[PDB]
Amino acid sequence: PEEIGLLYQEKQAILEAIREGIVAINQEGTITMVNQTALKLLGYDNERNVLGTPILQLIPHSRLPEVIRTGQAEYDDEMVLGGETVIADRIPIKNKQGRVIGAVSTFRN
Amino acid sequence: PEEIGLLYQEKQAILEAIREGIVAINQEGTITMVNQTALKLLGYDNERNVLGTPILQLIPHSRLPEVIRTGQAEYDDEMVLGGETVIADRIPIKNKQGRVIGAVSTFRNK
Ligand SMILES: [Mg+2]
């Protein structure tokens, strides 16, 4: 309850502190985290209609679901997002037991 | 980057570790965080179409937007949701400078 408060505060501080675009998905491919730089890249003003969407709705060429399926990181992937060429790094997220529970893309210009 | 991986892992752990339903919104009333228990109570299988939705489209009687306006915690509100009766405690979430950046409801089984 207060513990959820502090987590939400640290979440927002980390996302805001990262200059690159961040998009995280869960195991089913739903976007669960996104920072302001990624929303700008995708052409959105805020999290409404972006969080809780399948990643392939907003990024049809995303390899984040392949990172979930394989557990394999992918680095230095060029891709086009809204007429801009960006470089994507994609890493799996694991729980304490080593199960892949999501994946993150980092986009830089 | 690695930091986001660790944060995601700690979030998931902490969201499962709470037995109450959790729903969190940002200052615009958009759902930004939810746990398995709140999803089950809402009648959803996953975060899809729950995250990123304005709170009153899923919880019409929610006072979470009231908490954003007033900056003030609200306790002991009885609620029907999954045809289940629950008690909602609602607090504001502040950044390190004490500005309100969101609000969270805890749902306790009556
Ligand atoms: Mg490419």
Author numbering:
A (entry chain AAA): 200 to 308
B (entry chain BBB): 200 to 309
Give sentences copied directly from the paper behind this entry.
Membrane bound histidine kinases (HKs) are ubiquitous sensors of extracellular stimuli in bacteria. Here, we used solid-state NMR in conjunction with crystallography, solution NMR and distance measurements to investigate the transmembrane signaling mechanism of a paradigmatic citrate sensing membrane embedded HK, CitA. In accordance with the naming of the PASc domain, the periplasmic domain is termed PASp here. The PASp and PASc domains are connected to the TM2 helix by two linkers: the PASp/TM2-linker and the TM2/PASc-linker (topology and domain organization shown in Fig. 1A).
Crystal structures of PASc reveal both anti-parallel and parallel dimer conformations. The N288D mutation in the PASc domain retains the same function as the wild-type (WT) CitA. When the function of the N288D CitA mutant was assessed by a β-galactosidase assay performed in E. coli CitA reporter strains, we found that N288D CitA unlike N304D of DcuS was fully functional, i.e., activated by citrate. The parallel dimer arrangement was previously reported in VicK11 but the anti-parallel arrangement had not been reported. Both the WT PASc and N288D PASc eluted as a dimer from a size exclusion column (SEC) down to a concentration of 1 μM, maintaining the dimer state in solution as hypothesized for membrane bound CitA. In agreement, the parallel or anti-parallel dimer arrangements were found to be the dominant forms in solution, respectively, for the WT or N288D PASc domain based on the following two methods. An inter-N308C distance of 41.3 Å was obtained in the N288D mutant PASc, which agrees with the expected distance in the anti-parallel dimer arrangement. While some populations of dimers at smaller separations in Fig. 2D cannot be excluded, the distribution of large distances about 41.3 Å indicates that the antiparallel arrangement dominates. For the PASc domain in CitA, this CEST effect was observed mainly in the residues from the N-terminal helices that form the dimer interface in both the anti-parallel and parallel arrangements. This indicates a dimer interface rearrangement of the PASc domain in isolation where the PASc domains switch most probably between the parallel and anti-parallel dimer forms, even when CEST does not reveal the identity of the conformations exchanging. Although this dimer exchange seen in the WT PASc is functionally more relevant, its occurrence in the N288D PASc mutant helps to rationalize why this point mutation does not disturb the functionality of the full length CitA.
